[PDB]
Symmetry: C3
Subunit: 164 residues, 3 copies
């Protein structure tokens, strides 16, 4: 197979040709993007566990000189709050929104979703809330007022990478 | 240009320096992230075709030993259901929600979005539903009850990668 | 440490082993995915500035022969429109929806989110709108009718990469 450093006339930049080999297998990998050094983005499917508490996600190990980064993005969601299980990538259970007596009623209408994350001691602490129409939820509890706190009725993709 | 294997005192890890060359060009590529072997995430903009059926997406070819992975994430959405075309990245057509007579009325209010995916014979079968306020849609059809099935009024980014 | 080109019997493909070195450090990097040439996806957290105007994002520099690509995906959102600041990854300010007199009232209910992007002279021009229940907003302004234009009450992840 072999390999070599070629050069194209279009511009003034060199290139290391590895396309003769079918796969390049590395351990750690970094590359540059407009002067910044990055590692590849790595993705995980995430949900919150029962109980309305923050979701902890271990931070990836970064090469020397690079800092941990994180982004969470919405995949599926509903206004069911705790009354849900979104932990399967292929099916969702969404029962409905808790009513003032504690029963599961229809799904409420939605006003927003917040996803928040902070890095503490090589752990990302992720929190979320879903805002819903008022007048439905109990006065107190995980799902109360107009807010579904750290809801089960949410799946997000967590992206991590390292960057200078 | 040339290249070499350097070593930094910060820690106890080696490094293959290729930064003297402007571009490294590979065919297949894998790297490690906290002990797991991955290939780079690759992204495609996706919408459903007319008719309320599942969206099939071919699975990428994976190196030996690695398994196919997938994640879909929300980009744009509305409650128009079938009455939409979101297939352009630069503009959206969203006409409104089907009413009980079959006409296009105002956009209904939303209670959730589900995105689901399953791998079958090197094809990802993607399905989606948007939940809306009740009392608007016809009793039967693709958009019926409180659900917009496999809606046109949705764009998602499909991420694929391989992993052990 | 050293390195070499190995070959596995599973199939008929070669492999360049770099796993003896702890990190592979490149400048530009491209790889192939099912015949297409790509660069790694790179992610940035984004919000709109005050005033309801488009969000300009510089396009990354691409290797020779490759074209710029972009995808925006939803992270957090609400119906507050201009009455918000989502620019922190760890906390959100969302005050409420503008009412007909100009005051900040409760958050309105939502019918959709559009994220649009166009490439002009190595700049991505990103626009967004959030559709809300009618009868709430003033008749004119950035947030008017049933639309919140280029809203502050939105964070998105911008992904860029290059592709043939």
């Amino acid at each position: 197979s072999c390999l070599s450093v070629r050069y194209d006339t279009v511009g003034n930049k060199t290139e290391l040709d590895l396309k003769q080999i079918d796969v390049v297998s590395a351990k750690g990998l970094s590359f540059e993007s407009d002067g910044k050094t990055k590692t590849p983005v790595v993705s995980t499917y995430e949900t919150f566990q029962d109980g309305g508490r923050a979701k902890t996600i271990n931070a990836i190990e970064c090469p020397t000189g690079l800092n941990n980064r994180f982004a969470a993005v919405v995949s599926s969601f509903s206004t069911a709050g705790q009354n849900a299980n979104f932990s399967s990538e292929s099916a969702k259970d969404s029962q409905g929104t808790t009513q003032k007596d504690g029963s599961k009623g229809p799904h409420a209408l939605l006003s927003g979703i917040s996803l928040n994350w902070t890095l503490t001691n090589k752990v990302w602490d992720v929190t979320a809330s879903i805002g819903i129409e008022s007048g439905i939820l109990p006065t107190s509890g995980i799902d109360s007022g107009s807010l579904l706190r750290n809801p089960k009725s949410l799946s997000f993709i967590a992206f991590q990478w390292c960057e200078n």
